[PDB]
Amino acid sequence: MKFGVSSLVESLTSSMEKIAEHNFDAWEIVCEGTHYLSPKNIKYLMELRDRYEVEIVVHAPFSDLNPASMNERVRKLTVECIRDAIEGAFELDSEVVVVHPGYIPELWSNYVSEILDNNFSTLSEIVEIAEDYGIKIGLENMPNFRGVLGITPESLLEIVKDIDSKNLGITFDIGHANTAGNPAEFVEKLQNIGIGIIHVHAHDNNGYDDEHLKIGEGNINFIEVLEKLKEIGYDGVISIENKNIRDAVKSKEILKEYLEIVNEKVA
């Protein structure tokens, strides 16, 4: 069990050496904007992971991309952008790439079934690329918002369909799980999809909006959630997603305190 930060906290050099001066076991680089996995950023990150020693997880680009689009060119562009992230991950010796499910476009709200086919198509094409590069894709459960796919474990199954691959699993977002139901009841079901939970996002909210609050500032029972993870022997990374560095560091300590309280129970 290792703790990380999403660089989502702004430019890269501006955010990186400031994160590095703390004690996070892993960095989650989100492949967007100025943090994009360009050659320059790969080389910069490659040298940073040598001065220090940390694990890297990469978050694929997601913004203004729809894996589930009826527009074929939008789908093709989505695989192309996610290919950049997988390649960077490969170069970075990273082993996990986080990917978002798509959404139902307004024009095609009555054709949810065929929208799901689209997302499946794109995801297969992407998992195929992950297989070439020995990279695992963690499909991420989404916050409860109108039109978005993969809110529920059941809807995640409908995108995953019959994909049988040692390279497809789940990124468990605890915060998103709270907008849809009880975050502890997601663990069993998500672990039963593909290779199961291979990455975790940690943040808090009040069960309605994706607020990304500091741990404790919402109503998620994290103690209970850590229990379900320790139950399934989750050795991966718990990555923190907050609005600023200090809240993330406060989240770090608080969650490492709950891990203390968890492990002593097994006596």
Residues that bind a second copy in the complex, under the rule CB under 8 A = 8, 32-33, 61-66, 69-71, 73-74, 77, 80-81, 103, 105-108, 111
Task: Pick one of Mn ion, a second copy, none as the site partner of residue 74 (Cβ within 5 to 8 A by kind).
Answer: a second copy
Identify which of residues 117 and 210 has a Cβ nearer to Mn ion in the complex. 210
Identify which of residues 107 and 267 has a Cβ nearer to a second copy in the complex. 107
What is the spatial distance between Cα 119 and Cα 112, in angstroms, rounded to a whole number?
11
Report in angstroms how near the CB of residue 255 gets to a second copy at its nearest. 24
**Longest distance between any two alpha carbons in the chain, whole Å:** 56
Residues 6+ apart with CB under 8 A from 181: none
Report in angstroms how near the CB of residue 3 gets to a second copy at its nearest. 23
Identify which of residues 41 and 179 has a Cβ nearer to Mn ion in the complex. 179
- The sign of the dihedral angle between the CA atoms of 5, 64, 176, 265 is negative
Residues 6+ apart with CB under 8 A from 208: 144, 179
Q: Please list the residues that pair with 129 across neighbouring strands.
A: none
Task: Pick one of a second copy, Mn ion, none as the site partner of residue 186 (Cβ within 5 to 8 A by kind).
Answer: none
What is the spatial distance between Cα 220 and Cα 238, in angstroms, rounded to a whole number?
15
Identify which of residues 37 and 255 has a Cβ nearer to a second copy in the complex. 37
Q: How many of the other CB atoms lie within 10 Å of CB of 42?
A: 18
Task: Pick one of a second copy, Mn ion, none as the site partner of residue 24 (Cβ within 5 to 8 A by kind).
Answer: none
Tell me which residues in 131-170 interact with Mn ion (CB under 5 A).
140
Identify which of residues 34 and 219 has a Cβ nearer to a second copy in the complex. 34
- Candidates 82-90, 202-210, 248-256, 259-267: pick the segment binding Mn ion (CB under 5 A): 202-210
Q: With CA atoms as reference, report the closest residue to 168 among 199, 202, 200.
A: 199
Report in angstroms how near the CB of residue 210 gets to Mn ion at its nearest. 4
What is the spatial distance between Cα 105 and Cα 83, in angstroms, rounded to a whole number?
23
Query: Which stretches of the chain bind Mn ion, using CB under 5 A?
Result: 140, 210
